[model samples]
Target: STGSATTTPIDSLDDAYITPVQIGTPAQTLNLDFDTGSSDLWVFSSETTASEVDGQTIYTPSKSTTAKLLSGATWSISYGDGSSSSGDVYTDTVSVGGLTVTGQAVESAKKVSSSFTEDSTIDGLLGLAFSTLNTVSPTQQKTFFDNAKASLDSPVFTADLGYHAPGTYNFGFIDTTAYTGSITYTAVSTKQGFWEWTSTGYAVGSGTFKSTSIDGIADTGTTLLYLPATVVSAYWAQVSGAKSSSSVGGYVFPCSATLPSFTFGVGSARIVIPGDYIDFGPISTGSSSCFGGIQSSAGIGINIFGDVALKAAFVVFNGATTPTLGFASK
Candidate 1:
């Protein structure tokens, strides 16, 4: 099932992060995160005096003759991760891949968290997901997609996170090879800021679980899969030696044990989540223990299939053909 309203683009692979099409005549390059959870493109600026701007790559507006800062407009954003930033608004020529959008909306943060400032590899975040979740008010709101929609050959944009390869996130026109057959399409639910869907059912260890017939969302902004308590508990039972541990939080088990293969049925399609993906990465806390993908966010009221869940399948956002979304295989 899908989560909130609109679905945003995210690169699941470590190497495939988003890159900015800097503003100006001879546009510069900036690597950034494309977030759908909120709208508004922001980059660290050389002019920002904030301590967080240290170690972060700041866009030098002076280097770009075409960049313009909006006089009175300003913006600030807070993430679920407990980090925030505040800055002023500006208009500049921003490009992604070969697509260029003139007078695009942007933000320059003057104050930011030390966690954000200390990450030398991270420069800024590019909000390409949706305008509805945009931090900027309607009077001042304008997203990269809102401005560049007309220039695109198709309203659809595809993000391929080469996680297996690890490197730069690629953004541009959708490549047909990334998916199989014709794309399976769905409509964007007009709820909160998430891309919602109805799950036909689920499968574990080659056996199909009883149909829950639930509605859910696919969120790239979220880092893990948030499932219903009932379904999550049942899933954990299928693992050979799965157990709960306080150190790993919620449901976690040994990485060496055999795990079940699971799949979520959407309409006629079945998107599978491999066992390795469930216990894929090294522990976030740098431990020998590996973690499972499924987690319980009982009160959150919706399912969020994050990057780990998405890495197993190919997804497409065909906004050009009406505000529809599609998913498939690469």
Candidate 2:
């Protein structure tokens, strides 16, 4: 089976993309963040505490005739920040676009941190990462993509992220029209349970290219592009009045500053991020200082090619027996 879904940016900076997913027998629709960084299809639910509920729509399993609770099973996930979401598990019919997977494990959140409650744009998360990363206990669960892969025409999904605009996520097959140039394939190390791959090198603006290999994950869940501090520092140095402030967090510069484009290599192909994309946005309301979309991944311990990088290219999460990643300029 094949399916194609439209994904819209939740914020002006393209912080996250949300796709509408149909859950349960009655087809309760919820806008979910399709994240490649983690595994677990969790949603705000009827089980969630009233205090934790905000503007987000909750999935009521009881309302779905097809919903069946998975006894003695539970799940919990921490967002690296102190924030987390945890609760019971149930199996339900889940559909993205028109691709349906019967008896898919749907984590129903009983408790969610304020971070999630504060952000009303997203109702839940649909994890597209490897099944091994699923946080469910007692018996780990498989991601929707993993369960549907066998039936799909091709065991692959493509992420076509956009810059402050709606994008498309295609399952089962790649759309040749979405990208410009031939696709470049790269080996993925699934041992880490992420779409982990290595880049040959990077260049700041039109500066000299370094041939150093950088290991990183293609995480659509994250908003910014994170690389080594050395590379990040070099990027900020190119913009006048740029500084990494502890209070502000990461690097910030004058909104009027000229931002240099970022380019990273995949095999012999180089994908360049437009300079304007680096200007994430103003740090605060009406603030003249803007935050840099490219930051140091030092504290994170792993480089993240998040939305900033993904938006610049068409990415494929190939789920063949031996998983691989593909990137093509759009």
Candidate 3:
């Protein structure tokens, strides 16, 4: 038998997906963002500043019969979005769906950035990257996926993120019904503890698929795709009224402007993201300003194929000795 888990959406943001995880003896349920970008499973907790807290659920380590403090161990993480979190640690039974991981290290947040403090819905983040990326200081900890992999039928999981809808993150097995066509496999380089790969080339809208070596990570935690500045400039030139907006922090176009599709290549496999998905709605609900889902990766040191790109296809993150990525149309 294979292990499996279901994920839900955070409707308002239309950004990341959340999955319920149970920790401690009585299982304090929390909705966590399943992230592939970084590896640190930290949650807002009782240790957090009470005044800084908003509507997020707090995990009280002392309240759990099985929660034990891992003295001196701490973790801190800063995201690309500038949000950060830090906390002490606890070891307890952590379970996802029907899979249980005994004595898994669960970081309890003591400090959070303003971005996180303002968002009450996201309780924590479930790190899906490699154990090497774990943020625990003094000693790194393994993620829930790593701890549960030992008992899984296979060492793999699938990410099925949808567009303006629901999706699933299945563990230990693949569901053929979740995607169509053959899975195009690509070799992955995990030196950065991320699922990083290179695209043979790409095409903007119906334009010819030009050849350029674009290296990036498939990150579920991020909201947009970040490529080279020149690439972004080239793509936006085709759309009228699209201009770089330092005020908006990205390229913005007239809300009614037509957006062309974007296609990335994995060998000959062309994964095309629709124009509607690229628009990313308006800067605000009733504004004439709209943000382009694709932006510049000028100084980030690495590129990112965030949810805006990943949602266009079904992706598999294989954890074998040499991890390989599989992508297919949904």
Candidate 4:
């Protein structure tokens, strides 16, 4: 069948998105981050240390009649930002929107990084990446999408992330009404456990398109857009007062500075991100300096088309035998 859910931006900066999830038979609702870059559906739970728990909600498997321990099964995962969590595994009934999956692997966190503890915005992450990326030892567990795909009308999910507003996440079907024009499909490289694809090139404002191949992942979990240094610098150079600040750790510019929109290619289609979206707001409260939404991925060693880019288009993660990604202007 199908499922639909609302993904809400957690903060004013749209730092991350959170979607509510129903875990256990009695339904313990927890807001979770839907990360397309990772493959472990982990949650803050009763098993977590009390000292590490803040105001975030937790899932108590003991309270669910359907909860069954996945004996000896454990998992640990780390993110690029250095935030991490490790825990034991359980199989239980989990539901998102109206869709339900029985015996879904639900990893309960025993410990979480200080960053996750401080946010208190998301209880955990729901991984949408390939099952092969699962970090569980001995027996790797499949993602919720992978486990439920077999029973869905169509094995696919779509992300419609809005700017500073609520968005939609749909499973088993594409909502034609969510996007305008036609979708452009691209090959996905699942070997890396990410929704990785290639962009033809990018342009700053009305500048000429520099035709080149740029490989990157469509990561909804990430907050910013990261590209090669060359591309990032090219975009910033057009702004009058913009410069890279080592102390601040990224390119920043005057909040009142006139910024240019960014354009990226998906086949022949070009998606343009408005200049206001790139401003990213002031770095510190009441400060004139503003951080850019786009940054250099050179240090990270991989380009990431995160929420900054995804919010500009409607993205489809097709789970066909040979997976594919679809993009359409909204």
Candidate 5:
């Protein structure tokens, strides 16, 4: 039997979910964003600049009975979304759901950019990406999953994201009940810190599944779906009033307009994005003014399968020889 940990969504804001975690001895609880895009378990702390912290709770090492400072150690990291944090390191007992890891390195942020400080809900980030991406200087640190993997039956984790509702994130094991039907898997690349994969391409509505090779990254850290420029334009062509607007960044159209279901190809599996969620949110005061959830990756060559795209299916991030991805309807 495999040992594992499970986390239920503590809160969901526009599909950006957070999970509760216990750190140090006495079990101080903190809400963290479980991100697969970057690696670092850093949090706002006592050492943080007073003015820099907006409303986030600070992690106090001295208050924790098991918290110990790691001498000469420091960590710093930046995300593609422009959020950043950096600070000294501490080794402490970290627990998630029910699983615990002793001597897990927790980076206490002394400085956090506006992106994080303004976001009062997320106290820190629990990186699910490869440990190699950890920001600890001189020597990289292992993630909680990495520290616990040796004891697990399988070094695997699954993300079951839901829209406007609660979902589960499982570590070290796959709960088959979370998904429907046999999972369809595709090979993944880890050269980058993200779960990189090549999709067979996508289809707009009931159109033919064209044979276009598309490289994309699965990132829970991001809040919306990002695709290539050409693809974004092709999709907008289907929506009559859709226009690229600087106000909303991408394509915006009337909310009353019916959107076609967006379909993505993962090997043989075709996961479909419901049209209801496609109209991201309202962008203007006028009636039927909304932005598209699918944005263009014009400058950034990488396509990001953010929470918007992920919520449609159960995803398996396998830590195997090929590091494949398994997807099935929720």
Candidate 6:
């Protein structure tokens, strides 16, 4: 039931979003998002109309001799933000780091909106999270993990974000240096990649806000972190000069004040969100300045720990070996 949040402005050609990995003898570069909410590998293509394909990366099959088109299948995806894209089906050999998978399924969008084209840089999304949403067929037998599991040295893949540095996203092969030892692992459900959990409540600064208890799901596809109305309002109340402004959604406060550190209690684990994320700017003209950390999403079915939370930890999706998730630090 979680609806969409505001889209962040991203540079379309920034190297941070693109990574090159060797595919057999030849190297192939692809755009990928470290999404933990779903599982799949999708890319844009040249088959789409120029207008419908505005602001997104379009793959050129002619450039890669290994690329192939799937005649009968197609795909379309709608985000919580009211944006969507759809197109014909295709396949190609894809590589990340030293790992390569052949006949990987890709979606070649025939139509995409400007918002999606503008907000999300890169041509496609690579769903690393576990979800049955991936494309599988007789010709394209398994997902990248299912296909590459036998070849990978380890049954685990690691996602390392360099923190505002070059090579921000590095995939393939687990790096022992990134974590203390082994990661705390959780078995993945077959239906969706979501990590379902129950929360006792939320805490901001030193105060614990009761009545914030609810069921939550960890999602990577979402950009912003959402919390319940009562909990979010109370958290914002603690921020200096943080008052609801006109165009700001609900938690918008004056842009000048520094915000406080906030944490959420999910069972026994505690997650802390930085203050900068709680001091968000207006996404539009006359819009109220939103808090960077927590905001209200009245209809959102489950609380989502988006990139804001994922970036803080080293996450492992062990689809290649055991069907479990692992978390650590870099």
The local distance difference test score of each candidate is 0.65, 0.94, 0.87, 0.94, 0.83, 0.56
Q: Estimate each model's TM-score.
A: 0.85, 0.99, 0.96, 0.99, 0.94, 0.78
**Model 4: per-residue Cα lDDT over 298-329, one tens digit each:** 87978999999999999999999999999999
Query: Candidate 1 on 1-330: residue-level lDDT in tens?
Result: 011111222233232244545556676676677665557787888757755566666787777788787778878888755778878877788766556777887787777777678666657777755677677643557777767666666665554443444322333465665566665776767467556666777877688656777666665555567778777887889876676676766787766677776787666777777766666444665754667778776777677766656666666655553466576655
Model 4 CA RMSD to the hidden true structure, in angstroms:
0.8
Candidate 4: list runs displaced more than 4 Å: none
| Candidate 2, run of 10 with poorest lDDT | 76-85
Write model 6 residue lDDT over 202-275, tens digit each, in one string.
67777665535655555556656677777777787887667654454555666666777676554445555556
Count of backbone clashes, every candidate in sequence: 20, 0, 0, 0, 1, 16
Estimate the overall C-alpha local distance difference test score of candidate 4: 0.94
For candidate 1, report its TM-score: 0.85
Pairs that collide in candidate 2 are none
> What residue pairs are clashing in model 5?
255-288
List, residue by residue over 75-183, the lDDT tens digit for candidate 3.
9999988889998999988887777888899999989999888877789998888889998989889988888777788888888887888778888888988888999
Candidate 2, 276-296: lDDT as tens digits: 888878999999999999999
Q: Write the per-residue lDDT of candidate 5 for residues 116-189, one digit (tens) a residue.
A: 88888888999988888998988899987778777667878788877777677787788988888889999888
lDDT measured at residue 107 in model 4 versus the true structure, 0 to 100:
97
